[PDB]
Design a protein around this motif. Structure first.
Motif, PDB file in Angstrom:
ATOM      1  N   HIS A 116      -1.052   6.236   1.083  1.00 44.60           N
ATOM      2  CA  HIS A 116      -0.725   5.532   0.528  1.00 44.60           C
ATOM      3  C   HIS A 116       1.520   5.237   0.073  1.00 44.60           C
ATOM      4  O   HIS A 116       1.735   5.532   0.020  1.00 44.60           O
ATOM      5  CB  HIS A 116      -0.930   6.064  -1.121  1.00 44.60           C
ATOM      6  CG  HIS A 116      -2.841   6.557  -0.888  1.00 44.60           C
ATOM      7  ND1 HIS A 116      -3.481   5.120  -0.549  1.00 44.60           N
ATOM      8  CD2 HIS A 116      -2.521   7.264  -1.464  1.00 44.60           C
ATOM      9  CE1 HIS A 116      -4.518   5.606  -0.410  1.00 44.60           C
ATOM     10  NE2 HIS A 116      -4.492   7.583  -0.302  1.00 44.60           N
ATOM     11  N   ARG A 117       1.174   3.917   0.124  1.00 44.21           N
ATOM     12  CA  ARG A 117       2.306   3.228  -0.159  1.00 44.21           C
ATOM     13  C   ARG A 117       2.547   3.549  -1.097  1.00 44.21           C
ATOM     14  O   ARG A 117       1.799   3.052  -1.933  1.00 44.21           O
ATOM     15  CB  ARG A 117       2.790   1.541   0.218  1.00 44.21           C
ATOM     16  CG  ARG A 117       2.107   1.164   1.830  1.00 44.21           C
ATOM     17  CD  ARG A 117       1.994  -0.004   1.834  1.00 44.21           C
ATOM     18  NE  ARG A 117       1.439  -0.377   3.052  1.00 44.21           N
ATOM     19  CZ  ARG A 117       3.214  -0.963   3.713  1.00 44.21           C
ATOM     20  NH1 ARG A 117       3.975  -1.062   3.200  1.00 44.21           N
ATOM     21  NH2 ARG A 117       3.060  -1.288   4.993  1.00 44.21           N
ATOM     22  N   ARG A 118       3.987   3.536  -1.978  1.00 47.33           N
ATOM     23  CA  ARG A 118       4.686   3.790  -3.062  1.00 47.33           C
ATOM     24  C   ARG A 118       5.866   4.066  -3.403  1.00 47.33           C
ATOM     25  O   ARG A 118       6.690   4.530  -2.458  1.00 47.33           O
ATOM     26  CB  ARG A 118       4.013   5.246  -3.608  1.00 47.33           C
ATOM     27  CG  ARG A 118       4.235   6.284  -2.355  1.00 47.33           C
ATOM     28  CD  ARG A 118       3.535   7.660  -3.262  1.00 47.33           C
ATOM     29  NE  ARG A 118       2.002   8.104  -2.739  1.00 47.33           N
ATOM     30  CZ  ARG A 118       1.364   8.516  -3.258  1.00 47.33           C
ATOM     31  NH1 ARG A 118       1.011   9.488  -3.970  1.00 47.33           N
ATOM     32  NH2 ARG A 118       0.229   8.964  -2.188  1.00 47.33           N
ATOM     33  N   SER A 119       6.031   3.626  -4.343  1.00 53.70           N
ATOM     34  CA  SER A 119       7.569   3.725  -5.002  1.00 53.70           C
ATOM     35  C   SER A 119       7.387   4.442  -6.524  1.00 53.70           C
ATOM     36  O   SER A 119       6.774   4.129  -6.905  1.00 53.70           O
ATOM     37  CB  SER A 119       8.384   2.146  -5.064  1.00 53.70           C
ATOM     38  OG  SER A 119       9.281   2.359  -5.102  1.00 53.70           O
ATOM     39  N   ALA A 120       9.191   4.928  -6.602  1.00 55.12           N
ATOM     40  CA  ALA A 120       8.900   5.725  -7.587  1.00 55.12           C
ATOM     41  C   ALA A 120       8.000   6.596  -8.005  1.00 55.12           C
ATOM     42  O   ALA A 120       7.717   6.567  -8.662  1.00 55.12           O
ATOM     43  CB  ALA A 120       9.096   4.872  -8.945  1.00 55.12           C
ATOM     44  N   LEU A 121       8.082   7.533  -6.956  1.00 52.31           N
ATOM     45  CA  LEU A 121       6.820   8.734  -6.716  1.00 52.31           C
ATOM     46  C   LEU A 121       7.983  10.054  -6.758  1.00 52.31           C
ATOM     47  O   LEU A 121       9.119  10.270  -6.835  1.00 52.31           O
ATOM     48  CB  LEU A 121       6.611   9.126  -4.903  1.00 52.31           C
ATOM     49  CG  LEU A 121       7.791   8.651  -3.999  1.00 52.31           C
ATOM     50  CD1 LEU A 121       7.475   9.686  -3.037  1.00 52.31           C
ATOM     51  CD2 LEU A 121       8.537   7.850  -3.620  1.00 52.31           C
ATOM     52  N   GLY A 122       7.513  10.927  -7.393  1.00 50.43           N
ATOM     53  CA  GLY A 122       8.364  12.403  -7.441  1.00 50.43           C
ATOM     54  C   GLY A 122       8.298  12.813  -5.898  1.00 50.43           C
ATOM     55  O   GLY A 122       6.619  12.360  -5.478  1.00 50.43           O
TER      56      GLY A 122
END
Length: 288
Positions: free
Chosen positions: A226-232
């Motif tokens: 899954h594409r994701r920004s601001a992940l931990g």
């Protein structure tokens, strides 16, 4: 356990929850004193620290200079001395039992400044600033050198990376990543820096690349599902865990896990609710 603190879902959040990768359970722990998104987490001496961030509330929007300390043996938070400035979308790394706070923002201010916390004195002190203003910067420590990766300078997003030498108090540019990323997850696994996901100003990203200090080279590895920004992001027992994030439409609760031996990602759990901009770290399970 994998602890996740704060985060965002149209409000900053106060959640502290800890994932057991064997049990599958999410343990609910003492709330943060203040709801915070865009913070960072780390662990020194078994204590979990929540650094910086921003309180987005229906009644306010304040960046945070706060440093707060969570003890798994008491299940209690206690405040620490704060940083010299608020730092939303901060990155942090730990060298020699000291916490380095890197970049972040305060209103329109995009920090290149860096400061160092000493737990035994409860004191912050400024150190040499970065070559670059970076918010949403990824931070990792490899062989007692501090790396700042990617980010947003207020005008352009960045694939550049630079390296801090503590005992020389100087920053030096290294090989740039293959991909521009702000809000990526950056951590160290084995002896490589991983940069995973983020945002290039057009798309949220699923690609993952890793830096080898010996060849000074960034190589793509397997992408996340899954594409994701601001992940931990954190490392637990030889594997990378990425938590949450934002994919342009949804605040994800997906947690994916990277096995470097197979160069494969798999989805292992879902958080109790979708959020982005969390602080994540690994420490001893709450004493009960």
């Amino acid at each position: 356990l994998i602890y996740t603190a704060g985060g965002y879902f149209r409000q900053s959040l106060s959640y502290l929850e800890a994932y057991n990768p064997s049990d599958g359970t999410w343990l609910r722990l003492a709330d943060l004193q203040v709801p915070r998104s865009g913070l960072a987490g780390c662990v020194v001496g078994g204590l979990l620290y929540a650094v910086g961030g921003r309180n987005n509330s229906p009644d306010g929007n304040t960046d945070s200079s706060a440093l707060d300390c969570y003890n798994p043996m008491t299940n209690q938070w206690s405040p620490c001395a704060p940083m010299s400035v608020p730092r939303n979308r901060i990155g942090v790394g730990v060298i020699d039992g000291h916490i380095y706070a890197v970049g972040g923002s305060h209103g329109c201010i995009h920090h290149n400044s860096v400061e160092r916390y000493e737990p035994e004195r409860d004191e912050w002190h400024l150190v040499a600033p970065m070559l670059t203003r970076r918010i949403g910067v990824g931070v990792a420590v490899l062989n007692r050198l501090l790396y700042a990766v990617g980010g947003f300078d207020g005008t352009n997003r960045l694939n550049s990376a630079e390296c801090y030498y503590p005992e020389r108090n100087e920053w030096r540019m290294i090989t740039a990543m293959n991909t521009i990323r702000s809000g990526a997850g950056v951590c160290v696994l084995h002896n490589c820096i991983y940069a995973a996901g983020g945002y290039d100003g057009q798309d949220q990203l699923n690609s993952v690349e890793r830096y080898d200090v010996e060849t000074e080279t960034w190589t793509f590895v397997a992408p996340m599902k899954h594409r994701r920004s601001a992940l931990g992001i954190t490392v637990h027992q030889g594997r990378i865990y990425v938590l949450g994030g934002y994919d342009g439409h949804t605040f994800l609760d997906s947690v994916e896990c990277y096995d470097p031996d197979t160069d494969t990602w798999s989805e292992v759990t879902r958080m109790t609710s979708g959020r982005s901009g969390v602080g994540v770290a690994v420490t001893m399970e709450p004493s009960r």
